[PDB]
Amino acid sequence: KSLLQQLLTE
Amino acid sequence: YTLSEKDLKELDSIRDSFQCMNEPLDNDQQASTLAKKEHNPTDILNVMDITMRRLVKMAKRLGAFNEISEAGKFSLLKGGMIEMLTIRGVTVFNADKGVWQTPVDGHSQISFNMFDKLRPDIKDTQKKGFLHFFNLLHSDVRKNDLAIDIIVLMVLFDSKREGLVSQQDKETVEKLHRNYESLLHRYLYSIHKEEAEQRFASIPKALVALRKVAENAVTLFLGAGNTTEAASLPKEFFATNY
Numbered sequence: 222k223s224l225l226q227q228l229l230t231e
Numbered sequence: 232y233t234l235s236e237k238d239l240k241e242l243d244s245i246r247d248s249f250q251c252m253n254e255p256l257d258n259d260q261q262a263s264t265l266a267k268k269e270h271n272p273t274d275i276l277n278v279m280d281i282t283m284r285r286l287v288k289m290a291k292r293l294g295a296f297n298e299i300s301e302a303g304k305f306s307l308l309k310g311g312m313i314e315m316l317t318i319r320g321v322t323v324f325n326a327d328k329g330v331w332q333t334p335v336d337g338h339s340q341i342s343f344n345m346f347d348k349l350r351p352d353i354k355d356t357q358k359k360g361f362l363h364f365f366n367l368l369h370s371d372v373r374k375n376d377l378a379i380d381i382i383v384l385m386v387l388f389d390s391k392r393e394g395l396v397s398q399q400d401k402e403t404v405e406k407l408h409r410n411y412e413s414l415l416h417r418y419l420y421s422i423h424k425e426e427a428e429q430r431f432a433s434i435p436k437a438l439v440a441l442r443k444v445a446e447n448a449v450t451l452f453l454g455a456g457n458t459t460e461a462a463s464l465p466k467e468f469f470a471t472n473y
């Protein structure tokens with residue numbers, strides 16, 4: 222739930 | 232005088248973390264957007280997608296950034312992103328031609344007048360604010376890669392951003408901020424001891440202006456028209472009606 226977060230987590 | 236072995240090692244680490252910012256584009260869509268002779272609001276948002284995603288790789292390949300909690304990482308990126316773009320904006324900007332010139336792709340330019348298509352009642356204030364911040368950073372510091380990289384990290388590691396609730400995050404962010412700032416101090420004296428104190432003393436001022444310009448830039452895409460075809464990442468930092 223958030224591209225920014227997804228980029229961080231990936 | 233000259234830098235110690237320890238600082239040079241830290242400058243290598245900094246140089247490696249930012250080495251992705253100027254790498255060549257890999258996609259042709261992105262290259263094609265940057266090649267257009269005219270950029271509309273949607274095009275500007277796609278261009279920002281390139282920088283933002285690269286800004287995110289930089290932060291991830293940063294040792295110091297991995298000492299922060301996951302929620303603290305999000306918070307620092309969510310809050311410093313626009314400021315860091317604005318800084319990159321300054322270092323690739325040609326005040327004579329009035330255009331931005333990406334190192335990653337020569338022969339490619341973005342008109343400063345692209346502002347004339349953004350939010351109507353604020354677009355003029357922003358142009359002036361961008362050019363004011365630009366002019367607060369002297370030539371010798373603006374042109375020095377490592378110098379801007381260090382300042383980029385100083386704005387990133389801001390302990391007072393919304394979201395940084397963890398005392399541990401706050402403390403470590405303050406400590407990094409202080410260390411990075413001392414690095415820049417020593418660095419400026421190693422590359423030009425002549426006006427180093429004056430230069431270093433001016434950056435805090437310039438950073439207050441950065442914060443101001445970057446802050447009221449979040450709604451620049453309101454009243455700019457349909458941007459539904461633009462990259463989604465940039466639309467997480469910029470308010471849109473689509």
Ligand SMILES: C[C@H](CCC[C@@H](C)[C@H]1CC[C@H]2[C@@H]3CCC4=CC(=O)CC[C@]4(C)[C@H]3CC[C@]12C)C(=O)O
Pocket residue numbers: 275278279281282313316317319320321323331332333334335341357358361444445448451
């Ligand atoms: C792929 C990019 C292209 C370089 C251009 C980039 C530095 C420009 C393009 C759009 C510009 C912003 C527009 C909105 C904007 C409005 C403001 O008020 C403050 C500054 C910003 C964020 C601009 C910073 C510089 C940007 C990102 C790269 O090589 O890094």
